[PDB]
Design a protein around this nucleic acid. Sequence first.
DNA 1: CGGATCGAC
DNA 2: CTATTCGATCCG
Length: 431
Amino acid sequence: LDKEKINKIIMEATKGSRFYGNELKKEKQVNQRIENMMQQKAQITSQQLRKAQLQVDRFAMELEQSRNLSNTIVHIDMDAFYAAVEMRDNPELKDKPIAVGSMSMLSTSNYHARRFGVRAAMPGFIAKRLCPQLIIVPPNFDKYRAVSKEVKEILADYDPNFMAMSLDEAYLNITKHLEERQNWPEDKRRYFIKNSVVFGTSAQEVVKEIRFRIEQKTTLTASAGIAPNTMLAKVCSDKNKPNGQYQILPNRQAVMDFIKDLPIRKVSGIGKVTEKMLKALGIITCTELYQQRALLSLLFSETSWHYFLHISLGLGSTHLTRDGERKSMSVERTFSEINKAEEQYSLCQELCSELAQDLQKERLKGRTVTIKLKNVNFEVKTRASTVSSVVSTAEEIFAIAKELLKTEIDADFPHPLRLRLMGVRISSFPN
DNA sequence: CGGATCGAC
DNA sequence: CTATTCGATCCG
Ligand SMILES: Nc1ncnc2c1ncn2[C@H]1C[C@H](O)[C@@H](COP(=O)(O)NP(=O)(O)OP(=O)(O)O)O1
Ligand SMILES: [Mg+2]
Ligand SMILES: [Mg+2]
């Protein structure tokens, strides 16, 4: 299906739903927030622009002088992960458009199915109108967890302090390994086919060995970026996907040529909204994000343009900080409509139990409790409450969440809360 | 601290 | 029928 009929059936199948109501309502807030930003752009003077241009470029120099090309960062990323796993272990599904999910939602889809526009975060029933030969197949998370464990075993040989960002993804710092690998015999870097193969001394070659070894161990392909920092590496991981690599060599000129024409969306952390907002200023590539740096220092907060300047100069993180301790834990469930008050309490109590069980497993006790309610028109509320002494057991949590939900049914009274999702989150853990 | 929004997988 | 855990950030 073509790049016009896709958008045409999505609209055809979304039109007039309670969900699409809420999507239009979210679109206005965004367009308004843009309209407000264009009001500010109108009332920015020339003297302010030149006043900022100096202050920004004083900081840009502070960044540029401390640029760091000494480290070799790799990003590994599995291809069509949940789909690949399901394809691997069910031969029939190969050479056929699949998607892991339910009719309600799709985690992912394989590349065959992506040519019909079916993608991650699409509902099933829409993906079936886009492609009636789509086989939707339920997720087996425990397999995907097991498979991930198999790749993390390989990745640990190259950087034992690697950073598993997810099941399917990971940042590595292979700098220490590249120095050690320079003077290794062919015995230490030979691998047999599941008949023998050796891999070189270069970084390209280390990553070719890694990707090779994953394929022997899991029968799954992965893609990989190479670059002097994490931000770049993540983007060149996407470059030659599926089943490929890219290296941005460690020199300023090579960094900048890659950056030069790079759409800002492809940077991790710039998403749908930011793209549309910056696009209203005529910024689509990374060089344009640089040119407009001064203007941006006035329209956006300090950290937000501090980020945009790192992006424009091709900069990012150059050492992986061993994943820190969590700030919150949560559980939430979607269902067909609930509206009787006593059911909603029962349901909350159940969530507060699961959340207590989970805390039990990691031994954590928090001070803040936060319910989340989403009604049949997809309008989300969040209601929170922080307490002196920490809490942890199913009763203590429920005690607090009960009252927050009381306030909500009582506020809409005499009308009932017609809700489709409920959640409970605990936060404010100790030092 | 409470609440909404954004973004990633 | 049918649109799914967590950190970061901004603002009151
Ligand atoms: N919105 C979502 N909701 C639930 N699960 C999701 C999801 N998006 C992704 N996942 C799950 C399903 C995915 O298998 C897994 C990895 O996410 P990616 O790396 O972003 N996507 P993939 O690897 O499938 O394709 P490729 O990387 O080739 O683009 O996370
Ligand atoms: Mg992937
Ligand atoms: Mg992005």
